[PDB]
Design a protein around this ligand. Sequence first.
Ligand SMILES: N#Cc1cc([N+](=O)[O-])ccc1O
Length: 249
Amino acid sequence: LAKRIDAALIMKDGRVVKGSNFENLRDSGDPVELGKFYSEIGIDELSFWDITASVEKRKTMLELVEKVAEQIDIPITVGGGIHDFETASELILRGADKVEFNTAAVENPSLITQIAQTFGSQAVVVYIAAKRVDGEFMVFTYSGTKNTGILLRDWVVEVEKRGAGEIVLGSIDRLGTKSGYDTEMIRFVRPLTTLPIIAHRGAGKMEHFLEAFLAGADAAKADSVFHSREIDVRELKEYLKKHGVNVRL
Ligand SMILES: N#Cc1cc([N+](=O)[O-])ccc1O
């Protein structure tokens, strides 16, 4: 019942990279400054997804989490090429509240459980990227590029069994669109898990958020719509209250 509004930030070499081509002379790509803006306009949680080159990535991500954790006080999730237990554990110890796995969880589902048993299920988020292929929802890894042959309906159940705290449900069919979350995919996954479901991909207007929530999402994640100011968050959370949704205000 209690719904959340989450912001996603793409990170490269320690700086925020915008997901569209809007600009502003003052808007620096400093994650701490952007994190403070989000914290201060009432975003519930932040996720960072790091696309940095192989070689500097692991210390770049540790540096990032240390700076943002000192300075902001909403939960932070970190992800993007977290391959193993040691990497994830180092990030949680340097300050991240949660780590997000996709490819490595698919390839080694025990990883979910190892993190959950050490730091608590709350610390493990599994991002499931899914697409319709020949009439069925399949799971994709390597940033939407490898069809794993695993059914979405099988992987959701297994993720919960392994001890994940939450699922982000990213519709590859909604990637590059701004006409709404994949409410059909949301409805399909909802009876298969008791976990919080975070909807991702497709957000364009305030109504979209309403509709995801009514399809059974517990949170909705977006990037551009908030960074560009195209949706004012206080206004989003007042609209949602008015339409029957329990949000923090
Ligand atoms: N969280 C997250 C996230 C994940 C992916 N991804 O698993 O490709 C891309 C962008 C994101 O903001």
